[PDB]
């Protein structure tokens, strides 16, 4: 996260960390949506361009963290995966369209003041909150600059941008399954996700029922906090039927 600050304890209790066993390194960010499901970006698991194709056995999910590198003994929980599901039309060949994937934990986790799932949005909440100018929050333990790793979870609040601007900022083809967010060069405010933050959650707080919803997933950007550029996120609501389906089909 660039130009973001340190989070507070229990500020994003649904923030998960995908950890690799060997070598032991941070891979991506993810979020907890029930006591057995974690959601992330599919490129965090499969990205053939760079021979990336992890399997159940190769990852660890760490929930309840604040610190990036410490094993916060008695606060975080580490789970193993039972199954990983990548969206069937995930497009890694062109624009990372439908960048989403679900992970089933071996055993359910218990919630605590530090572990609590986030809400997935419903047509109405999507409709009322995904509006340009509205801010969302992104969190992660990713890099602090483009080219500088934090010791604690970082947070930054970014505005959603109007699609035409998003499109006119890159040469990549944008689809309706993505939205972009960030400040205009003109707004003298910055912030952005960066390497290491991928897979994590973009959330908004409903002013109707005070709950936090996860509207997008950190998917991609060109550089970190470059002016005239933005971050793109998977549109969770547009792919929610898929979600429901693997869940009530497999658990």
């Amino acid at each position: 996260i660039v130009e973001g600050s340190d989070a507070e304890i229990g500020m994003s209790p649904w923030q998960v960390m995908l950890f690799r066993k060997s070598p032991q390194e941070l891979l991506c960010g993810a979020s907890l949506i029930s006591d057995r499901w974690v959601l992330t970006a599919a490129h965090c698991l499969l990205y053939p361009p760079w021979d990336k194709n992890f399997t159940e056995n190769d990852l660890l999910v760490r929930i309840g963290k604040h610190s990036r590198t410490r094993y916060e003994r008695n606060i975080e929980k580490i789970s193993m995966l039972e199954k990983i599901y990548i969206h069937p039309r995930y497009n890694w060949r062109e624009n990372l369209d439908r960048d989403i994937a679900l992970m089933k934990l071996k055993k359910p986790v218990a919630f605590s003041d530090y572990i609590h799932p986030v809400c997935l949005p419903d047509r109405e909440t999507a409709a009322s909150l995904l509006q340009a100018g509205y801010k969302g929050r992104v969190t992660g333990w990713g890099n602090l600059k483009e080219t500088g790793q934090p010791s604690v979870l970082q947070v930054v609040n970014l505005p959603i941008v109007e699609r035409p601007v998003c499109k006119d900022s890159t040469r990549i083809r944008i689809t309706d399954n993505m939205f972009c967010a960030g400040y205009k060069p003109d707004e003298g405010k910055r912030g952005d996700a960066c390497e290491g933050d991928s897979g994590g959650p973009f959330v908004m707080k409903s002013p109707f029922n005070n709950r936090w919803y996860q509207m997008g997933i950190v998917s991609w950007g060109e550089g970190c906090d470059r002016d005239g550029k933005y971050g793109f996120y998977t549109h969770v609501f547009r792919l929610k039927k898929w979600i429901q389906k693997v869940i009530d089909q497999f658990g």
Binding site: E8, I9, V118
Partner: peptide, 28 residues
């Protein structure tokens, strides 16, 4: 999940974090 999105240390105790204001304030 019924109970989803309500944080034990904030919503559940009626405590706000330092920047949520910024967000609610952007919603209008």
């Amino acid at each position: 999940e019924a109970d989803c999105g309500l944080r034990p240390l904030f919503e559940k105790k009626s405590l706000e974090d330092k920047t949520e204001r910024e967000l609610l304030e952007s919603y209008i």
